[PDB]
């Protein structure tokens, strides 16, 4: 709902933008949920940031998988890219690669060259579904 969301991002720099993009991706991707949770920065501090967490559908060789991810929105959003992770369940393992480290953090050209209004969440997820579709970031263990 537009109301509950507006309250979550109370302490955001650009709330009107952040919510409208948020509403759009949650609509299109029914299984991504907005959530508050403390993020720990490189310095050691903890701000309470919104986290679009859930799964996205990703075709991989004839089969569609629900790849689990985390999209951390900084409070300066949309003028900085989200901080993106894959969130492997305990039965999955992270496939390390060019776009993924062992902590599950995602690295993409789209994130690097992020620029508002040129870039937004919907665009990022579109790209993700392509990158993971070619090279899955997570695999299920035997």
């Amino acid at each position: 709902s537009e109301s509950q969301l507006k309250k979550m991002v109370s302490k955001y720099k650009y709330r009107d933008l952040t919510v409208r993009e948020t509403v759009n991706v949650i609509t299109l991707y029914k299984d991504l949920k907005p959530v508050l949770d403390s993020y720990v920065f490189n310095d050691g501090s903890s701000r309470e940031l919104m986290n679009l967490t859930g799964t996205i559908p990703v075709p991989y060789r004839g089969n569609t998988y629900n790849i689990p991810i985390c999209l951390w929105l900084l409070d300066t959003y949309p003028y900085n890219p989200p901080i993106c992770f894959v969130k492997p369940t305990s039965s999955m393992t992270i496939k390390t690669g060019k776009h993924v480290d062992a902590n599950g953090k995602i690295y993409l050209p789209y994130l690097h060259e992020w620029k508002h209004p040129q870039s937004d969440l919907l665009g990022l997820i579109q790209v993700m579904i392509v990158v993971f579709g070619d090279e899955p970031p997570v695999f299920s263990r035997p």
Binding site: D31, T55, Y60, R61, N63, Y65, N66, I67, P68, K87, P88, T89, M92, T93, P136, V138, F139, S140, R141, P142
Partner: peptide, 10 residues
């Protein structure tokens, strides 16, 4: 509710 899934390790 959807369960997360990933391709099986071969």
């Amino acid at each position: 509710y959807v369960e997360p899934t990933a391709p099986q390790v071969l």
